[PDB]
From a paper:
Fusion proteins comprising PP1(7–304) joined via a (SG)9 linker to unphosphorylated substrate sequences were coexpressed with Phactr1(516-580) for structural analysis. This approach allowed determination of the structures of the IRSp53(449-465) and spectrin αII (1025–1039) complexes at 1.09 Å and 1.30 Å resolution, respectively (referred to hereafter as the IRSp53 and spectrin complexes), but was unsuccessful with Tbc1d15, Plekho2, afadin, and cofilin. The Phactr1/PP1-IRSp53 and Phactr1/PP1-spectrin complexes crystallised in the same spacegroup. The substrate sequences, whose N-termini are largely unresolved, make extensive contacts across the PP1 catalytic site, then extend in a sinuous trajectory across the composite Phactr1/PP1 surface, making numerous hydrophobic and ionic contacts. Like the Phactr1/PP1 holoenzyme, the complexes contain a presumed phosphate anion at the catalytic site, and thus appear to represent putative enzyme/product complexes (see below). IRSp53 and spectrin make virtually identical contacts with the PP1 catalytic cleft, predominantly via their mainchains. In both structures, the residues +3 to +6 form a β-turn, allowing the hydrophobic doublet L459-L460IRSp53/L1035-L1036spectrin (+4/+5) to make intimate contact with the Phactr1/PP1 hydrophobic pocket, entirely burying the +5 leucine sidechain. These interactions are stabilised by hydrogen bonds between the mainchain carbonyls of substrate residues +2, +4, +5 and Phactr1 R576 K550, and R554, and between the sidechain of the substrate acidic +6 residue (D461IRSp53/E1037spectrin) and Phactr1 H578; a hydrogen bond between the D461IRSp53 mainchain carbonyl and Phactr1 R579 is substituted by a hydrogen bond between the E1037spectrin carboxylate and Phactr1 R579 mainchain amide. At position +2 (G457IRSp53/E1033spectrin), the mainchain amide and carbonyl make hydrogen bonds with the mainchain carbonyls of PP1 R221 and Phactr1 R576 respectively; in addition, the E1033spectrin side chain spans the top of the amphipathic cavity to make an additional salt bridge with the Phactr1 R576 side chain. The most striking aspect of substrate recognition is the role played by the composite surface generated by the close apposition of the Phactr1 extreme C-terminal sequences and the PP1 hydrophobic groove.
Author numbering:
A (entry chain C): 516 to 580
B (entry chain A): 6 to 298, 325 to 335
């Protein structure tokens, strides 16, 4: 089969910004009760507020409470 | 009214400021960016058909300062055309500025600037990996719900010049025809399994023959023979995807039949990776531009 794309043999490199990229990790700070409350919050949001096309309602992702 | 030029100017002006400087958009401005971009997404196909020249970028994860650096190197829109592969928010310091600039550029240059959906552009993931909390800190939960409506309308994949298939994650055992992508209706959530899940979640694995289990707890891995068979069936030359940190910002798989792009250098200050973008010229020559300085993969089921 005939291939159309090709790749350059030389990459350009430049220096990235030098700054502190560390960010908060809130997903490591969830108690069991917090997780239950979030599952409930997501389920209620998706069942009462979030618009989904009829033909895609079978894709909406619910969590076991 | 959306004063789009004012929003863009204010987002770009921090380029000369200390790293991490926030941009003071109003709630109504951000809601306008979400509503107008959503309308544009819905007016364009869910499977984008794009033409080179194009610059293709992988995950950004709220590294706004790095996004500005990437645009400085590649050319600020509309000097170059862009396709981003998803994962704009979460797991970084400035998801809001990042997504706001991307949405503003989509509205300003709707035929020259393109955003695909990543697995972090859905409620169940960005509820917990940082974006909801960032929205709550700076604005309110209702604004997070407005972003969710916009993300639910993003396109899912793109084909560049009938030869490069682009998506965030990867291939799917359910993907037999491109029509199956085109039949997905928006707005939609990302399911826990099936075609749309796999397009946003799957990964290549050199040690897998065929399809395998994915240790993220969702979707699949796929081997080099799956890539080769897919490209042959669809008369494609390359799969271009993102979704994994790679040391050089780009990494080939399956004798250069697949490439992974990752555009957030020094990811979340914990990894020593570069960030890259792939430029495709009008003759379909692909080249890389790099910005060089596990625990990194997101997972499903953290709530369960
Ligand atoms: Mn990512
Ligand atoms: Mn991802």
């Amino acid at each position: 089969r005939k291939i159309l794309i090709r790749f350059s043999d030389y990459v350009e490199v430049a220096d990235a910004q030098d700054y502190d990229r560390r960010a908060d990790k809130p997903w490591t700070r969830l108690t069991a009760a917090d997780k239950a409350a979030i599952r409930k919050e997501l389920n209620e949001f998706k069942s009462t507020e979030m618009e989904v096309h009829e033909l895609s309602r079978h894709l909406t992702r619910f969590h076991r409470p | 009214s959306l004063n789009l030029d004012s929003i863009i100017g204010r987002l770009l002006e921090v380029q000369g400021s200390r790293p991490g400087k926030n941009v003071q958009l109003t709630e109504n401005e951000i809601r306008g960016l979400c509503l107008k971009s959503r309308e544009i997404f819905l007016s364009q196909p869910i499977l984008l058909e794009l033409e080179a020249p194009l610059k293709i970028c992988g995950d950004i994860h709220g590294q706004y300062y790095d996004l500005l650096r990437l645009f400085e190197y590649g050319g600020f829109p509309p000097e170059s055309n862009y396709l981003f592969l998803g994962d704009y928010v979460d797991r970084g310091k400035q998801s809001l500025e990042t997504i706001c600039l991307l949405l503003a550029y989509k509205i300003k240059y709707p035929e020259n600037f393109f955003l695909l959906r990543g697995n972090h552009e859905c409620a169940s993931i960005n509820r917990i990996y940082g974006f909801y909390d960032e929205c709550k800190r700076r604005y309110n939960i209702k604004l997070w719900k407005t972003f969710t409506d916009c993300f639910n309308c993003l396109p899912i994949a793109a084909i560049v010049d009938e030869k490069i298939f682009c998506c965030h994650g990867g291939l799917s055992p359910d993907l037999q025809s491109m029509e199956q992508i085109r039949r997905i209706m928006r707005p939609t959530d990302v399911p826990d399994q099936g075609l749309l899940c796999d397009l946003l979640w799957s990964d290549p694995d050199k040690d897998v023959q065929g399809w395998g289990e994915n240790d993220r707890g969702v979707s699949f891995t796929f081997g080099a023979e799956v890539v080769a068979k897919f490209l042959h069936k669809h008369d494609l030359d390359l799969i271009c995807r993102a979704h994994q940190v790679v040391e050089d910002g780009y990494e080939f798989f399956a004798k250069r039949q697949l490439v992974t792009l990752f555009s957030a250098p020094n990811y979340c200050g914990e990894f020593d990776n570069a960030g890259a973008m792939m430029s495709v010229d009008e003759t379909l020559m692909c080249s890389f531009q790099i910005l060089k300085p596990a625990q990194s993969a997101s997972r499903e089921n953290l709530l369960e």
